[PDB]
Write a protein that binds this DNA or RNA. Structure first.
Lengths: 50, 124, 51, 50
RNA sequence: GUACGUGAAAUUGCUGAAAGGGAAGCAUUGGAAAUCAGUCUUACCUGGGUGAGAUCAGUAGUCUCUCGAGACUAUGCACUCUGAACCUGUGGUAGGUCAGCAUCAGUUUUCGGGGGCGGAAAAAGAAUAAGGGAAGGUGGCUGUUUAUAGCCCUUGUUGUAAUACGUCCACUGGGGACUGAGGACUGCGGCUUGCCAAGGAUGCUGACAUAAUGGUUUUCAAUGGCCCGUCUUGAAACACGGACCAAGGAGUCUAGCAUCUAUGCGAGUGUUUGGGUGAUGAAAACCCAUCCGCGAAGUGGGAACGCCCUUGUGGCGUGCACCAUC
RNA sequence: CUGCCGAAGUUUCCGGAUAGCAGAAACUCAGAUCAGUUUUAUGAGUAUGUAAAAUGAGAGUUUCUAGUGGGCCAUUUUUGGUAAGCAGAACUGGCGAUGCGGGAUGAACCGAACGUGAGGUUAAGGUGCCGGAAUGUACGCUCAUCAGACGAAAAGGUGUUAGUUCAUAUGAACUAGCCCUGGGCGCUUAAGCGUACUACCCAUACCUCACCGUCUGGGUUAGCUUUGAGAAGCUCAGACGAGUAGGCAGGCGUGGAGGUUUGUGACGAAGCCUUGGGCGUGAGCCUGGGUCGAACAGCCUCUAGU
């Protein structure tokens, strides 16, 4: 479990940095890089049952 | 262990203070157009099961004991093992000849009596 | 079991039980030590600095 | 995703709301899918795994 | 005290207390006044001394059960026991209500400190080596171009600047409030058998207790509060019933039918029309001769079980009730 | 008395037989199906129906058995209207069975749907005073000598504010906003109106906890010194809580009967009185004091002129 947790945290850091590096490269090259749409959505109900 | 009472005021019958013919004992309001039944604001409360008290402390006196009605010495001897949970309560119709013998017996048994000084005097 | 629920984000003892990885986390790691190269070409700047 | 699971995380164990106070709760109900801990539950939710 | 057992309510008189600007009125929370429950240290532990006596005797009898188990009797009080009486202990340890603090746990609120990352790898800006320009123009003279003030733009510039903002820290320091459910040990963890903030509060103190804490009644203050039942009507509006109190006052008994449950027996079942019988009430209970009433008149899925055997998985059989197929 | 379920208020044929709605029982199933669901795509004509991916929930029955078998308002759709309004149908929910915060007040408006409570946080609406909460910040608009604040109404204005455009610093034509004319106290660089951003107030709503009850899912016997087997007990966990008609369950009380308490009573039964005390969510029950004077009660069962 501890090894799995470390691997997950390593994956998150690499996935965030690579998004930053891709945007930095596109900004320097003058092109436009569009990040992928997210598959995860957190939905909260705001109105009551009436 | 402390006894918690959700409510201390009794539930009086609606409109029982306006008429002598209507007693204080709680009666469920059957009127459909009654404000008390529909529980408006300012209307009195009604007996609900939510007011029910803790099971562990139910039937317990403020001193932590449960009342046990006693009619003779034989009744008070039953509380030999339950003297820390129950208090002896001599019945109202037990004469003063037996009230004294119940109180003396309950003294050796280590049993609290709720009305031990009734219908008697002292002589030191 | 579980008479009372304890928050791992406040109770460090429960967090150590739930996650056997908090003991070695290193939350703040220095990445940009002494390089920090400004990466914004003139083509991007011209488009941004428009109108 | 991490704070919601840690503070408000409650599993549905046998049609009941059982808080995730132990990894054995998640493992007993999600061990069939190689999910054994709470950070594995967070990883599956965050990265939208299989 | 014949206005005669008990003597309720409505109602009336007097007395006392309190309240009172055109209602009362009830509820919620407290105050005040009056009035109550409501309680206490008194026992435990450990002696020693003294004597005491049995469930104690290097003891003798009786009785009832069944050797030894109870009850006694006589004798001893040495052995054991009696927290056994008292003297000596000046030894110890001391519960209920209300408070204060500390260490914690759950929840929550409110102030900070430090750091990582992102953003034009902030924009500015300072410093700063230059170039150009104009101004709402310094000097020269409105016009003018750094002077006898400077400003703007561009590069350069230290630089890998700082800051703001966003985001993150299983980074950290305080303050406040509300809760303490559960009750040997189990478990999950962290330290190092033990220890712990880890499957829910414990420590350290006090005072008062012999008042505080409460409770009740009256009353005041704040806030709220349209008259009940019936019918009507979405709803109400309504129209009705209600001067007050006491007592009485309305789904009952029975015959038939059907469902359901329980009970008895079961291809049966039902004694009470009657007869027998019943001495202690004999209208009960108990017993049953003859009738009669009502009843009688193969293939699939599947409950359950055995056997396996890659064992779980599935397969091989046996297949109730019931439903589909002939 | 309490608790748990709980409609419908109407299709359809026609006072009804159905059905629907709501429960009971027996069945078979979670490796089976289902949905006031969203899709995909096939077709057909932005939608449409059908068939087969996501999401959620275990589903399908069979039998018989209570009640309803009015509407109001609101939304949308509507056809004609026609002094104008409106009327007419249909479409859909809410109320009708439902309290709560705001809305001055009010049944249809804005929030929110309900066990008993402590703490926290909000919704709608609010923060000058009545009134809990900023006489908050930053811009503007408005002067009324009826503002505003919560149809004569179109327009006119030697009425403004911002002004725009066009003519040659002015004037004309215009562009809008607001004023003039046509809940209370009070407020006027607002306590008015519009915009933006912080802070704050509090509902029965939301979160955490405790307690009550119900429902659901477990555990518990060579009854182990944890002793907690009225197994009709004990115990663990989670969810939930409006309610008329109606359905169901468990309890309180009264007269009499069988049994029982080797029951209470002239040392005071029953009854009544009481700002005495206690118990129960409640029906009710126990008790002190006073009064009183001969009978009476708890428990199991039976019964009813309860």
């Amino acid at each position: 479990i501890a090894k799995r947790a470390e691997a997950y945290e390593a994956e998150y850091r690499a996935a965030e940095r690579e998004q930053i590096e891709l945007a930095r490269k596109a900004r320097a090259e003058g092109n436009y890089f569009v990040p992928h749409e997210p598959k995860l959505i957190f939905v909260v109900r705001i109105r009551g049952i009436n | 262990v402390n006894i918690i009472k959700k409510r201390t005021k009794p539930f009086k019958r609606h409109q029982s203070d306006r008429f002598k013919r209507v007693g204080e004992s709680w009666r469920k309001p059957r009127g459909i157009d009654s404000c008390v039944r529909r529980r408006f604001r300012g209307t009195i409360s009604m007996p609900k099961i939510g007011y029910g008290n803790n099971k562990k402390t139910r039937y317990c006196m403020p001193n932590g004991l449960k009342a046990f009605l006693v009619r003779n010495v034989s009744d008070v001897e039953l509380l030999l093992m339950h003297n820390k949970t129950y208090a002896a309560e001599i019945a109202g119709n037990v004469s003063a000849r037996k009230r004294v013998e119940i109180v003396e017996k309950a003294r050796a048994l280590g049993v609290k009596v709720t009305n031990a000084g009734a219908k008697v005097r002292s002589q030191e | 079991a579980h008479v009372q629920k304890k928050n791992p984000l406040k109770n460090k003892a429960v967090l150590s039980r739930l996650n056997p990885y908090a003991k070695a986390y290193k939350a703040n790691v220095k990445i940009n030590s002494e390089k920090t190269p400004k990466a914004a070409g003139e083509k991007f700047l011209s488009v941004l600095h428009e109108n | 995703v991490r704070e919601l699971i840690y503070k408000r995380g409650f599993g549905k164990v046998n049609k009941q709301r059982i808080p995730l106070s132990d990894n054995a709760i998640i493992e007993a109900a999600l061990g069939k899918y190689s999910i054994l801990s709470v950070e594995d539950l967070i990883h599956e939710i965050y990265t939208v795994g299989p």
